[PDB]
Amino acid sequence: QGTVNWSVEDIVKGINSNNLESQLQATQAARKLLSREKQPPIDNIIRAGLIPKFVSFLGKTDCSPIQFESAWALTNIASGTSEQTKAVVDGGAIPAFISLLASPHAHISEQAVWALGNIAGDGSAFRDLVIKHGAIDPLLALLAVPDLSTLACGYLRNLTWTLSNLCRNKNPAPPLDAVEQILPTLVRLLHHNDPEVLADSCWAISYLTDGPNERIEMVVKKGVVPQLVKLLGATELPIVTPALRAIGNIVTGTDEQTQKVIDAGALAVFPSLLTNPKTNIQKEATWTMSNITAGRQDQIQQVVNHGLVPFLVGVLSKADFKTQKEAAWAITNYTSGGTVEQIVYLVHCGIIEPLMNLLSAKDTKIIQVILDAISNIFQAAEKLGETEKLSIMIEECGGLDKIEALQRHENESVYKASLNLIEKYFS
């Protein structure tokens, strides 16, 4: 009640006094204003020019409470818009917070961790700026214990989250040496028993694997794939989501990198993923599948062996359109690099009808994708001399009607392929 609902001008008055305790009192009052969920007066506090004062309070070693209160107040200012975070940075908060990482008071170093997390989370520039100030060493030292379980849950969760922000964002991606420096601790967090630490550890790994093959390799070589695959089967959605994202990122790389995902036993989880109630999970799982069917023939064969083709037929038959679109890609990739037998197996699974039905979609791009898949399947049928057997299949399900109509489509690329099919296999 003492420091509850102060006016900004009273806070300004207490902070401008030459009384450290008065300043502490005013700072707490500011912290409480900024701690409210309904429109905290962040811009009002900034306009009052209180930031430089807060920053100086960070270095008041003899008055830890005011160190804590200002750190908390600055954290919440830094949690706002880019402009508001910039204000905190502009005040010299970065080095001051990094100095607090070594505080003997756990709740104060934690607040510093939290603050740096918000600053780094703004984007690439501030992220790299926090790194240049040398935040990584002191951050990792806080996690350098024989067993993470001895750390307070909240403390560990904050450390993990802040680290994940240091791994986040592109253009540019985090510095290579920074990633290398962080990875070993990150891998360790990836094995912790706490659901929130696991979720944010997966997000970190997902950020790191979201780039060129070299970035993917840095992570893969650390041997995290088996663990990712395991977390991929976790019950918690917040864990599955980032885990799937990471696996999805990894299979966009080389065939060898993709193979590690397969060897880890990832495909066995996909019967669930491809039928998951959360559409975002279905979409990303199908997307992941499309990048696997874009692999080698022995990898396509692994997809067949795990009985995932029927699941692709299902998603193609019924699913959120965005998911169905990833399924169309999955089939086209499959038919592009697959053997004749593998492609034939596709048809026997019933891929044709659900494929034809999606030719009624208004998305020009999916029509192009489907038409290419058809071409590929006919080419496989040509080597068997059974193109006609396919023509009847497509005709009986009302596919020919749609291909014919696609000749009067408005898009150049579409009708070209349409008539090519029409006059080559249907005349």
Binding site: S35, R36, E37, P40, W72, T75, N76, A78, S79, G80, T85, Q111, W114, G117, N118, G121, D122, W161, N165, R168, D210, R245, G248, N249, V251, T252, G253, W287, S290, N291, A294, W329, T332, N333, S336, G337
Partner: peptide, 14 residues
Amino acid sequence: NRKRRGMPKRQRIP
């Protein structure tokens, strides 16, 4: 074929 590729801030409340 080829392969196709694809909260940051937290306020501390009571």
